[PDB]
């Protein structure tokens, strides 16, 4: 049987190290007009805007390439005990899953 520690140590999310500037693969699970809700598999989805080039190629279910900035957007503000979560992740939409 695999101890939890053993799993955590080998997982791809541990392999990544710091999540700044990492090329990642993500998949679009929801759309509002120009807004793509992209699950890249970490915790929170990110949300990017539908690009001008090949706009109609982006559909629920599509796969895309992301540049991860921050795994969760969070900060502490003046006078607060805890940080504030936006409940989102920060990413740059590059192109779609060149294959």
């Amino acid at each position: 049987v695999e101890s939890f520690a053993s799993m955590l140590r080998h997982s791809p999310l541990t392999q990544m190290g710091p999540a700044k500037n990492k090329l990642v693969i993500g998949q679009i699970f929801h759309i509002v007009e120009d807004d793509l809700y992209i699950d890249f598999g970490g915790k929170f989805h990110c949300v990017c805007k539908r690009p001008e080039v090949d706009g109609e190629k982006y559909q629920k279910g599509t796969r895309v390439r992301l540049r991860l900035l921050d795994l969760e957007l969070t900060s502490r503000f003046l006078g607060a005990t805890t940080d504030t979560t936006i409940l989102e992740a920060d990413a740059v939409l590059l192109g779609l899953q060149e294959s």
């Binding site: 929801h30 509002v32 007009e33 807004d35 809700y37 949300v47 957007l73 900060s75 503000f77 003046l78 504030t84 936006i86 989102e88």
Partner: protein
Amino acid sequence: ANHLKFIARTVMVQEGNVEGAYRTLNRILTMDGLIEDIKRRRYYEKPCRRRQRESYETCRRIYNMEMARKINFLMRKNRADPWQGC
């Protein structure tokens, strides 16, 4: 007074539009606080009174700065809501 003249707080007007040059000057002076300083030196302001002002200003700035920061951080989430009428 012992410096050379006309090199300082001087703007040269372009294509003869003066209102614009003057605006530029006034922006230069506002930016460097020369305007507030001029205005504040019309009367004297006793030291304790000045201490109090500086402190109030810095508080004010801290707060505005931080509120602004939280605005620009929260700004993403103003987008049309995905989950409407859930």
